[PDB]
Design an enzyme around this catalytic site. Structure first.
Site, PDB file in Angstrom:
ATOM      1  N   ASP A 196       7.276  42.773 -43.912  1.00  0.00           N
ATOM      2  CA  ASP A 196       6.681  41.681 -44.931  1.00  0.00           C
ATOM      3  C   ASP A 196       5.085  41.768 -44.361  1.00  0.00           C
ATOM      4  O   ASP A 196       4.765  41.621 -43.031  1.00  0.00           O
ATOM      5  CB  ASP A 196       7.381  40.478 -44.617  1.00  0.00           C
ATOM      6  CG  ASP A 196       6.502  39.610 -45.340  1.00  0.00           C
ATOM      7  OD1 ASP A 196       6.645  39.583 -46.566  1.00  0.00           O
ATOM      8  OD2 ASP A 196       5.865  38.532 -44.837  1.00  0.00           O
ATOM      9  N   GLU A 232       4.886  46.571 -46.287  1.00  0.00           N
ATOM     10  CA  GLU A 232       4.390  45.928 -47.933  1.00  0.00           C
ATOM     11  C   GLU A 232       2.922  45.832 -47.758  1.00  0.00           C
ATOM     12  O   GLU A 232       2.517  44.874 -46.794  1.00  0.00           O
ATOM     13  CB  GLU A 232       5.040  44.440 -47.989  1.00  0.00           C
ATOM     14  CG  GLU A 232       4.409  44.119 -49.358  1.00  0.00           C
ATOM     15  CD  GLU A 232       4.235  42.514 -49.311  1.00  0.00           C
ATOM     16  OE1 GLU A 232       4.003  41.987 -48.046  1.00  0.00           O
ATOM     17  OE2 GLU A 232       3.827  42.044 -50.311  1.00  0.00           O
TER      18      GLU A 232
HETATM   19 CL   LIG Z   1       7.858  44.515 -51.475  1.00  0.00          CL
END
Ligand SMILES: [Cl-]
Ligand SMILES: OC[C@H]1O[C@H](O[C@H]2[C@H](O)[C@@H](O)[C@@H](O[C@H]3[C@H](O)[C@@H](O)[C@@H](O[C@H]4[C@H](O)[C@@H](O)[C@H](O)O[C@@H]4CO)O[C@@H]3CO)O[C@@H]2CO)[C@H](O)[C@@H](O)[C@@H]1O
Ligand SMILES: OC[C@H]1O[C@H](O[C@H]2[C@H](O)[C@@H](O)[C@H](O[C@H]3[C@H](O)[C@@H](O)[C@H](O)O[C@@H]3CO)O[C@@H]2CO)[C@H](O)[C@@H](O)[C@@H]1O
Ligand SMILES: OC[C@H]1O[C@H](O)[C@H](O)[C@@H](O)[C@@H]1O
Ligand SMILES: *C(=O)[C@@H]1CCC(=O)N1
Ligand SMILES: [Ca+2]
Length: 495
Positions: A196, A232
């Site tokens: 993340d 990400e």
């Molecule tokens: Cl994602």
């Protein structure tokens, strides 16, 4: 860079906000027999319990500690899920929120999913434990302490993403606490991680953290298995930070993919499907072997992150199935399928004021995923992965795995078709008139079940049938009014 999925499984599904017990069951009763490769679960670590708004989905991106205790379940249930899923050959990928802790303005106390105490104001998270010198307060140089300009690569990495207390990932202690958490997950059996907010971390700090990770659990994976890593990073061009800056650590989310596909399928900006014949790097996308692709993700399906108006979702079912269908049929990248829950989307001016609404619940308790007799889900779980048109395309991708993109056809507008070696062929009609033509399928002669309109069951097709002649040609007829204006056939849907 390897998914570590069972040989022959080419996709993972994001069971967004699902409970560990429901995922465990889903692996056994559905994902394994339908050939799904794995599941990306929501953050399994303790997070802030936000009451206003009431238990939004995003509270899970505000860590309080690394205890595996969330609304999805406790550690026992988490371990139970991973073990049961690995036992049937379905992998688990964890959404690792390691860039930060909670919002710096959240009240101190025990309003957390496991009751751990934390004090954002004093940078105090004793359950880890982390204190003030484990954050980037002194390192950030912005007036607000938050990220204010994405054209400045440094503040993007050293300041607070929308106020989230930024961890000092340069410190070996912080790196170690994070690695401790990740190894706990690895030893339990997880095959990889979605990192993340990777854009907000220095690639070199991420690398340092990965240096401390164990090899995958040797009971399930071959000795020396490195965990799958997909970071990400929202990179649509225009900014100093590029997706390629993270290739050293593993794969990267290719957000250009869904943004493009969405506008082509909606036929916006003068585009059409015929342009898709050089889909992939031909469109400015990162290398196929580093790309983690998807049509929509949990953020952009509800206006968060970077999606824009062209993102397709279960809300636009007809075009969505087509888009997901195209993705699953095309060899570019490693595919992730979204599985969502329904919420009262209510647009005001340009924005959905209910974009915060969390998963189905009874006063905070997440509702179980009920399975209806027709195999769809109840309790508002959309379960796009159970939609026949999507589920069958997931198997399509497995069946044609490794086959080359070939036999492309287009009418110069929105009627296209292409095959994957001699194992599969797909046809799309997105023009406002009928698509009726005989095409070269590159497939062996025979009768094939169209897996979009139906299934193959004990000798027969439950939907449309396609007849391939000895010369590989078959006639296709798709009305622009068809429920699903596309057809797909493959080696295993053949009678
Ligand atoms: Cl994602
Ligand atoms: O002991 C009571 C306290 O316990 C917890 O304190 C922990 C810290 O919050 C946590 O950061 C970590 O502390 C380590 C530092 O993170 C790490 O950099 C290094 O610290 C160095 C420091 O950089 C250097 O300038 C200093 O003079 O020497 C340190 C080494 O002693 O090691 C730290 C200690 O391991 O772990 C702490 C202990 O668990 C609570 O967070 C805190 O509130 C309590 O008061
Ligand atoms: O290339 C030579 C120049 O590099 C140096 O600029 C550095 C910054 O000093 C450095 O802080 C930054 O890299 C670090 C983060 O700051 C750090 O906290 C974390 O551990 O990871 C990053 C890299 O992994 O990067 C820039 C660029 O290298 C140095 O300041 C200059 O004097 C040198 O000439
Ligand atoms: O609930 C399952 C159904 O959801 C949506 O209506 C899809 O458009 C449909 O194809 C699917 O069968
Ligand atoms: C790929 O996802 C993982 C992390 C980088 C590597 O070598 N394997
Ligand atoms: Ca950061």
């Amino acid at each position: 860079y390897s998914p570590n999925t069972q040989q022959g499984r080419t996709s993972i599904v994001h069971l967004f906000e699902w409970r560990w017990v429901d995922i465990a069951l889903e692996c056994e009763r559905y994902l394994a027999p339908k050939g799904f490769g794995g599941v990306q679960v929501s953050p399994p670590n303790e997070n802030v319990a936000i009451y206003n708004p009431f238990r939004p989905w995003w509270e899970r991106y505000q860590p309080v500690s690394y205890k595996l205790c969330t609304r999805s379940g406790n550690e026992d249930e988490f371990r139970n899920m991973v073990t049961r899923c690995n036992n049937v050959g379905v992998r688990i990928y964890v959404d690792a929120v390691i860039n930060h802790m909670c919002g710096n303005a959240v009240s101190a106390g025990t309003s957390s999913t496991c009751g751990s105490y934390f004090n954002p104001g004093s940078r105090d998270f004793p359950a880890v434990p982390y204190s003030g010198w484990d954050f980037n307060d002194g390192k950030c140089k912005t007036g607000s302490g938050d990220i204010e300009n994405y054209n400045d690569a440094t503040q993007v990495r050293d300041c607070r993403l929308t106020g989230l207390l930024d961890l000092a990932l340069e410190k070996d202690y912080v790196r170690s606490k994070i690695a401790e958490y990740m190894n706990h997950l690895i030893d339990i059996g997880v095959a990889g991680f979605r990192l993340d907010a990777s854009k907000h971390m220095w690639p070199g700090d991420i690398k340092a953290i990965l240096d401390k990770l164990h090899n995958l659990n040797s009971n399930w994976f071959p000795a020396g298995s490195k965990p799958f890593i997909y970071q990400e990073v929202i990179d649509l061009g225009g900014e100093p930070i590029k997706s390629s800056d993270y290739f050293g650590n593993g794969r990267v989310t290719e957000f250009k993919y869904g943004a493009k596909l969405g506008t082509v399928i909606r036929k916006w900006n003068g585009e059409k499907m015929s342009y898709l014949k050089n889909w992939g790097e031909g469109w400015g996308f990162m290398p196929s072997d580093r790309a983690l692709v998807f049509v929509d993700n949990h953020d952009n399906q509800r206006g968060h992150g970077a999606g824009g108006a062209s993102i397709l979702t279960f809300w636009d079912a007809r075009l969505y199935k087509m888009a997901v269908g195209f993705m699953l049929a095309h060899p570019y990248g490693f595919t992730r399928v979204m599985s969502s829950y329904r919420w009262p989307r209510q647009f005001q001016n340009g924005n959905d004021v209910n974009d915060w609404v969390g998963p189905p619940n009874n006063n905070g308790v997440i509702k179980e995923v009920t399975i209806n007799p027709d195999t769809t889900c109840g309790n508002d779980w959309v379960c796009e992965h159970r939609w026949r048109q999507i589920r069958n395309m997931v198997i399509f991708r497995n069946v044609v795995d490794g086959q080359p993109f070939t036999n492309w056809y287009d009418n110069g507008s929105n009627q296209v078709a292409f095959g994957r070696g001699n194992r599969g062929f797909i046809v799309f009609n997105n023009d406002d008139w009928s698509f009726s033509l005989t095409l070269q399928t590159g497939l062996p002669a025979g009768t094939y079940c169209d897996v979009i309109s139906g299934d193959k069951i004990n000798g027969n097709c439950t939907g449309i049938k396609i007849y391939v002649s000895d010369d590989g040609k078959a006639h296709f007829s798709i009305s622009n009014s068809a429920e699903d204006p596309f057809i797909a056939i493959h080696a295993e849907s053949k009678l």
